[PDB]
């Protein structure tokens, strides 16, 4: 316990436009919401790993500016009724937050899993791409 003031990065990684949003332990106080679509232009690449690194590096910079040094992780897919699977980008954001100075510990997944309700969007035959 060498005074690692803690944070929770709470990457929310969807199949498009992932999120990195570091807040206090209680989660009440936000620090650098800055997201995936913040730093990319295509709007198709919002989920791309490069968006993850860009968002992660800038939120890490803001993290050093404020003072937070150690971070716990709340990885979250879209969850609910949608696909239950972590977004492609968010993993790259995890890697970047690991790299850029920040100390990391206590990795957790908090994807909201339902207990079978709220009939999934799409109809019977479902998406028919």
Partner RNA sequence: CUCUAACUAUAAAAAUCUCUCUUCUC
What does the alpha-carbon distance between residue 38 and residue 76 come to, in Å, rounded to a whole number?
A: 19
Q: Which of 50, 64, 112, 114 binds other proteins (CB under 8 A)?
A: 50
What does the alpha-carbon distance between residue 51 and residue 86 come to, in Å, rounded to a whole number?
A: 15
Give the list of residues 6+ apart from residue 28 with CB closer than 8 angstroms, or none: none
Closest distance to RNA from the beta carbon of 88 (Å): 6
Query: In the complex with RNA, which residue's Cβ is closer, 23 or 47?
Result: 47
Give yes or no for residue 109 binding other proteins (CB under 8 A).
yes
The 3-state DSSP class for residue 27 equals coil
Determine the interface stretch with other proteins among 22-30, 59-67, 120-128 (rule: CB under 8 A): 120-128
Query: In the complex with RNA, which residue's Cβ is closer, 67 or 126?
Result: 126
Site residues (CB under 8 A) for other proteins, limited to 11-30: none
What does the alpha-carbon distance between residue 4 and residue 105 come to, in Å, rounded to a whole number?
A: 11
Closest distance to other proteins from the beta carbon of 105 (Å): 4
**Are the C-beta atoms of 79 and 111 separated by less than 8 Å?**
yes
Q: How many angstroms separate the Cα of 48 from the Cα of each of 37, 64, 90?
A: 10, 25, 9
Give yes or no for residue 8 binding other proteins (CB under 8 A).
no
Give yes or no for residue 83 binding other proteins (CB under 8 A).
yes
Determine the interface stretch with other proteins among 22-30, 59-67, 87-95 (rule: CB under 8 A): 87-95
Binding site for RNA (CB under 7 A): 88, 129
């Amino acid at each position: 316990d060498n005074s690692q003031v803690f944070g929770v990065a709470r990457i929310f990684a969807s199949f498009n436009d992932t999120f990195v949003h570091v807040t206090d332990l209680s989660g009440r106080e936000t620090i650098a919401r800055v997201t995936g679509g913040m730093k990319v232009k295509a709007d198709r690449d919002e989920s791309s790993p490069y968006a993850a690194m860009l968002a992660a590096q800038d939120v890490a910079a803001k993290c050093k500016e404020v003072g937070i040094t150690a971070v716990h992780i709340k990885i979250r897919a879209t969850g609910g009724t949608r696909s239950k699977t972590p977004g492609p980008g968010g993993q790259a954001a995890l890697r970047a937050l690991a790299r850029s100075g920040l100390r990391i510990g206590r990795i957790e997944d908090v994807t909201p899993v339902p207990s079978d309700s709220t009939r999934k969007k799409g109809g019977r035959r479902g998406r028919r791409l």
